[PDB]
Design an enzyme around this catalytic site. Structure first.
Site, short mmCIF file in Angstrom:
data_model
loop_
_atom_site.label_atom_id
_atom_site.label_comp_id
_atom_site.label_asym_id
_atom_site.label_seq_id
_atom_site.Cartn_x
_atom_site.Cartn_y
_atom_site.Cartn_z
N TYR A 1 0.84 -1.44 0.10
CA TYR A 1 -0.11 0.03 -0.13
C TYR A 1 0.93 1.15 -0.01
O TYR A 1 0.67 1.91 0.97
CB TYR A 1 -0.69 -0.19 1.12
CG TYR A 1 -2.01 1.24 1.61
CD1 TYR A 1 -2.66 1.31 0.40
CD2 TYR A 1 -1.78 2.00 2.49
CE1 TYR A 1 -3.85 2.51 0.61
CE2 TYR A 1 -2.94 2.92 2.78
CZ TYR A 1 -3.76 3.09 1.75
OH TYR A 1 -4.64 4.06 2.06
N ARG B 1 -1.27 8.31 -3.88
CA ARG B 1 -2.44 7.21 -3.18
C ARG B 1 -3.51 7.87 -2.66
O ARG B 1 -3.63 9.00 -2.15
CB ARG B 1 -1.56 6.60 -1.98
CG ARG B 1 -2.29 5.28 -1.22
CD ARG B 1 -1.46 4.64 -0.19
NE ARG B 1 -1.30 5.58 0.84
CZ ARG B 1 -0.45 5.35 2.00
NH1 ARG B 1 0.39 4.44 1.85
NH2 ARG B 1 -0.57 5.98 2.91
N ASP B 2 -4.69 6.91 -2.59
CA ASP B 2 -5.92 7.42 -2.37
C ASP B 2 -6.29 8.83 -3.16
O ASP B 2 -6.59 9.76 -2.39
CB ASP B 2 -6.10 7.68 -0.93
CG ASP B 2 -5.00 6.42 -0.16
OD1 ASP B 2 -5.91 5.29 0.03
OD2 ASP B 2 -4.13 6.65 0.58
N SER C 1 -4.65 12.65 1.49
CA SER C 1 -3.77 11.44 1.13
C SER C 1 -2.67 11.39 2.13
O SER C 1 -1.78 12.39 1.96
CB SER C 1 -3.53 11.18 -0.19
OG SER C 1 -2.40 10.15 -0.34
N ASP D 1 -7.78 0.69 -2.10
CA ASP D 1 -8.25 2.02 -2.52
C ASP D 1 -7.43 2.47 -3.79
O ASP D 1 -7.06 3.53 -3.49
CB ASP D 1 -8.30 2.87 -1.28
CG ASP D 1 -8.96 4.33 -1.42
OD1 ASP D 1 -9.84 4.37 -2.17
OD2 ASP D 1 -8.20 5.20 -0.80
N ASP E 1 -8.70 5.11 11.27
CA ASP E 1 -8.99 5.38 9.69
C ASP E 1 -8.47 6.78 9.45
O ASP E 1 -8.22 6.94 8.39
CB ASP E 1 -10.31 5.13 9.34
CG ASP E 1 -10.91 3.71 9.49
OD1 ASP E 1 -9.95 2.63 9.45
OD2 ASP E 1 -12.22 3.68 9.80
#
Ligand SMILES: CO[C@@H]1O[C@H](CO)[C@@H](O[C@@H]2O[C@H](CO)[C@@H](S[C@@H]3O[C@H](CO)[C@@H](O[C@@H]4O[C@H](CO)[C@@H](O)[C@H](O)[C@H]4O)[C@H](O)[C@H]3O)[C@H](O)[C@H]2O)[C@H](O)[C@H]1O
Ligand SMILES: *[C@@H]1O[C@H](CO)[C@@H](O)[C@H](O)[C@H]1NC(C)=O
Ligand SMILES: *[C@@H]1O[C@H](CO)[C@@H](O)[C@H](O)[C@H]1NC(C)=O
Ligand SMILES: *[C@H]1O[C@H](CO)[C@@H](O)[C@H](O)[C@@H]1O
Ligand SMILES: *[C@H]1O[C@H](CO)[C@@H](O)[C@H](O)[C@@H]1O
Ligand SMILES: *[C@H]1O[C@H](CO)[C@@H](O)[C@H](O)[C@@H]1O
Ligand SMILES: *[C@H]1O[C@H](CO)[C@@H](O)[C@H](O)[C@@H]1O
Ligand SMILES: *[C@H]1O[C@H](CO)[C@@H](O)[C@H](O)[C@@H]1O
Ligand SMILES: *[C@H]1O[C@H](CO)[C@@H](O)[C@H](O)[C@@H]1O
Ligand SMILES: *[C@H]1O[C@H](CO)[C@@H](O)[C@H](O)[C@@H]1O
Length: 363
Positions: free
Chosen positions: A85, A90-91, A97, A137, A317
């Site tokens: 990941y 990313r995201d 992010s 994701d 999260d």
């Protein structure tokens, strides 16, 4: 070399890593007493995936593998579980992010460097069966969020990086599962074929990697695996649980060139249904949740290789602190537990919530 045929979760036992166990035992247990304290000790024994969310985390992967080898010498027969990941940008759809790499700043090149470190560890530890979830994701955003500039502009990079990862990690002791969102994301009928087409293209573009066993769903989410009644927030979507989702997209994968694709579904936070989600799209530290079905290959369903705990319950999260960097408003909603720490950091009250509402119960 830990080779296998068929379901990679059969014939081995998922390793419960020291990282998570340390969090529970040193950050959670000292705050508990009686039944709760004893129930918490048990949670640390349930195997969950170790996230390689930064390059600095890679030495931890080797250490974990080193531990497993030692155990396996004493008849342990354990398998490692990790999550790749660290894609650049990313995201892309996230309002914040935490990724350390960015496309604009040689992100793709840095990603390949990250993967190279991982391949050398896996090559070094070919004697240990390694189960991996590939980039949660990521591809799911390319299906529904191309309207978001960052996602639209991260497409080629995501596909090139994912391709490098699946081809470079395509080894005999490896089993990779590509993240495929969840029922509430790609489960909707309208997103089914487009999603199936993308995953099938990633598989074929990577020369149909033998190590690429299938897809991972509900990673870091809360959908039920097989709940029999549609929760209010799933209104309109006939595919309201993960079982329905994998059974709908599975045949479509085959229609697009990827047959023999299997799945694994996260249930680490799916124990209480319905959840406290006021909107299905609310993903941050959802209230009203509990640890769910324990990891096991005895799924009683052809398409599901195994129930797994990918997102480690207790790890946050996202932060609810509006002044903090990477603050995502989803983490301040009325259905999100607050106050919450930075993403990935230990969130005690959430661990307690999960333990309290666990099913199967720990207490
Ligand atoms: C209405 O449909 C919804 O669509 C949106 C897309 O616009 C979906 O939103 C996305 O949901 C994802 C989960 O379903 C989350 S993933 C989120 O961030 C990361 C990645 O999983 C996790 O944090 C990481 O956790 C690791 C282990 O604890 C740490 O090691 C690491 O440091 C952390 O960064 C986090 O736990 C996840 O919650 C997307 O962020 C979100 O955009 C929505 O799901 C659909 O329902
Ligand atoms: C196929 O792999 C190449 C590797 O260079 C990558 O650039 C491309 O985006 C991939 N295409 C798809 C559809 O995954
Ligand atoms: C859902 O799956 C779990 C674990 O396999 C099982 O115990 C339960 O009976 C299933 N529920 C239904 C309605 O099939
Ligand atoms: C690698 O080799 C072993 C030999 O025991 C097999 O059991 C496995 O299926 C894989 O082919
Ligand atoms: C992995 O290890 C467990 C012990 O925790 C066994 O029960 C299983 O059969 C496998 O050897
Ligand atoms: C064990 O490891 C966890 C995770 O890094 C720490 O939070 C804890 O303090 C201990 O070092
Ligand atoms: C952390 O350590 C405690 C005490 O050793 C255990 O009870 C727990 O299971 C985890 O390993
Ligand atoms: C959790 O971390 C503490 C140190 O902060 C250890 O003493 C304990 O054994 C566990 O690993
Ligand atoms: C464990 O949880 C308690 C709250 O009940 C805290 O006071 C402690 O510092 C630790 O986080
Ligand atoms: C939970 O139960 C264990 C024994 O089963 C105790 O050691 C602990 O103090 C807690 O009451």
């Amino acid at each position: 070399t830990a080779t296998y045929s068929g379901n990679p979760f059969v014939g081995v036992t998922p390793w419960a890593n020291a990282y998570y166990a340390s969090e529970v035992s040193s950050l959670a247990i000292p705050s508990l007493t009686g039944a709760m304290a004893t129930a918490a000790a048990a949670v640390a024994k349930v195997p969950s995936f170790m996230w390689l969310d930064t390059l600095d985390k890679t030495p931890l992967m080797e250490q974990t593998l080193a531990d497993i080898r030692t155990a396996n010498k004493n008849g342990g027969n354990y398998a490692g579980q990790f999550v790749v990941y660290d894609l650049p940008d990313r995201d892309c759809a996230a309002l914040a992010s935490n990724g350390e790499y960015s496309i604009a700043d040689g992100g793709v090149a840095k990603y390949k460097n990250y993967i190279d470190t991982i391949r050398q560890i896996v090559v070094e530890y070919s004697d240990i069966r390694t189960l991996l979830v590939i980039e949660p994701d990521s591809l799911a955003n390319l299906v529904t969020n191309l309207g978001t500039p960052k996602c639209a502009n991260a497409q080629s990079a995501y596909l090139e990086c994912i391709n490098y990862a699946v081809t470079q990690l395509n080894l005999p002791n490896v089993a990779m599962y590509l993240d495929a969102g969840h029922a509430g994301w790609l489960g909707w009928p309208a997103n089914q074929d487009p999603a199936a087409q993308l995953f099938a293209n990633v598989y074929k573009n990577a020369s149909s990697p033998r190590a690429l066993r299938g897809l991972a769903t509900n990673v870091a989410n809360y959908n039920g695996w097989n709940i029999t009644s549609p929760p209010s927030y799933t209104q309109g979507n006939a595919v309201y649980n993960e079982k329905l989702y994998i059974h709908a997209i599975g045949p479509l994968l085959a229609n697009h060139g990827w047959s023999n694709a299997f799945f694994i579904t996260d249930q680490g936070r799916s124990g209480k249904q319905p959840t406290g989600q006021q909107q299905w799209g609310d993903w941050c530290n959802v209230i009203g949740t509990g640890f769910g079905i324990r990891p096991s290959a005895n799924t009683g369903d052809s398409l599901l290789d195994s129930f797994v705990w990918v997102k480690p319950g207790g790890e946050c999260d996202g932060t609810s602190d509006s002044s903090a960097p990477r603050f995502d408003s989803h983490c301040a909603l009325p259905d999100a537990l607050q106050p919450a720490p930075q993403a990935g950091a230990w969130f005690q009250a959430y661990f307690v919530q999960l333990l309290t509402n666990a099913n199967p119960s720990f207490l």
